[PDB]
């Protein structure tokens, strides 16, 4: 199966994805903005990274290139959208 997976989402869906991945023996990677450093999903993953600038926390999650670069740097093999954010944006699939 996949060696590592990156979840580009926030909240309980990220924790559900992490639990499902751990049940399958797959590593997990998380991304968070500065304003959301106190979320639980940050400490539920094996590795966490900070994305975006010092403002616009919502726009940080809507950045295909940054997420792709972070996944490439972390050696991930898959990206899980979840629901909401870039879950139905074709640019993510194209990238």
């Amino acid at each position: 199966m996949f060696s590592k997976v990156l979840v580009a989402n926030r909240g309980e869906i990220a924790i559900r994805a992490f639990r499902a991945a751990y049940e399958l023996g797959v590593g997990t990677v998380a991304v968070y903005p500065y304003e959301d450093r106190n979320s639980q999903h940050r400490l539920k993953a094996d590795e966490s990274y900070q994305i975006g600038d010092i403002g616009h926390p919502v726009h940080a999650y809507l950045s295909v290139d940054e997420i792709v670069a972070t996944a490439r740097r972390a050696g991930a093999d898959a990206i899980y959208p979840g629901y909401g954010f870039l879950s139905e944006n074709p640019d993510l699939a194209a990238a």
Binding site: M1, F2, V5, G11, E12, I13, I15, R16, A17, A20, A21, E23, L24, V26, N38, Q40, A78, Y80, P81, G82, Y83, S87, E88
Partner: protein
């Protein structure tokens, strides 16, 4: 035939309680190149049994409009028992 949502919603757990089939793990295994034959998901042993329902708890005030309210949580007591499932959990002192 209003439309077709090409993703997973927040209500899938409801069907997970009647068909006892994992959705996210099956999705991840399908993305890895598995068919619905080694997974055992074939259509002669899928039968619902029981009923189920789901509700969501928000910070909206039903008194002043329905706008969200922000603050620090000063007391949290959860629940559980027979036939109860909880998704998402905050902590004491959260903002």
């Amino acid at each position: 035939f209003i439309e077709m949502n090409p993703r997973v919603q927040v209500e899938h757990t409801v069907t997970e309680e009647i068909t006892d089939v994992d959705l996210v793990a099956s999705q991840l295994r399908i993305a890895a190149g598995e068919t619905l034959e080694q997974l055992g998901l074939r259509q002669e042993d899928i039968a619902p049994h029981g009923a189920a329902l789901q509700c969501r708890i928000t910070t909206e005030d039903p008194a002043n409009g329905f706008r969200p309210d922000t603050g620090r949580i000063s007391a949290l007591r959860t629940a559980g028992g027979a036939g109860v499932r909880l998704d998402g959990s905050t902590n004491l002192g959260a903002e």
